[PDB]
């Protein structure tokens, strides 16, 4: 569970950095992530969570950079939208994997 914990923690931190830069309302994602991480505290599932989280990190970083570089309203909105979409996709994947993790944790 250590790799998943570390990756999710890093994603939480990345989300807050994006919030600081962009002003986007990403706190619900942060809270959902924190809660799921709390649940975590099978190796295949951990691989799944780790790679998904790190990938999402890269995308949020990149799109936040696109927000910084935004020259207009359209570029800005497209980048914000991209952040929201990737974070929801990521959270759906991590939620699913953590629930499966629980099922495996039983038997």
């Amino acid at each position: 569970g250590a790799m998943a914990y570390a990756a999710v923690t890093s994603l939480m931190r990345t989300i807050h950095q994006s919030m600081e830069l962009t002003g986007c309302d990403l706190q619900p994602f942060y809270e959902k992530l924190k809660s799921l991480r709390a649940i975590l505290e099978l190796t295949i599932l951990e691989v799944e969570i780790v790679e998904v989280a790190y990938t999402t990190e890269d995308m949020v970083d990149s799109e936040s950079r696109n927000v910084f570089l935004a020259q207009n309203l359209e570029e800005r909105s497209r980048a914000m939208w991209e952040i929201f979409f990737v974070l929801e996709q990521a959270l759906e994947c991590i939620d699913s994997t953590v629930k499966q993790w629980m099922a495996t944790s039983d038997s």
């Binding site: 986007c24 497209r78 914000m80 939208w81 929201f84 929801e88 996709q89 759906e92």
Partner: protein, 56 residues
Amino acid sequence: XXXXXXXXXXXSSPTIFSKEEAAKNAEEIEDAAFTIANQHXXXXXXXXXXXXXXXX
């Protein structure tokens, strides 16, 4: 604009992966794309419409 997003969305899987309007819109098109893919360009532009409709 919405057409672009429609094209990105346009782009079966068990291995896939003003401000409130944008966030909500995104969340919805996400969830829809995910149900369709979960069935594992069809209903791609169809997805942006309801999403656009739901958030506006």
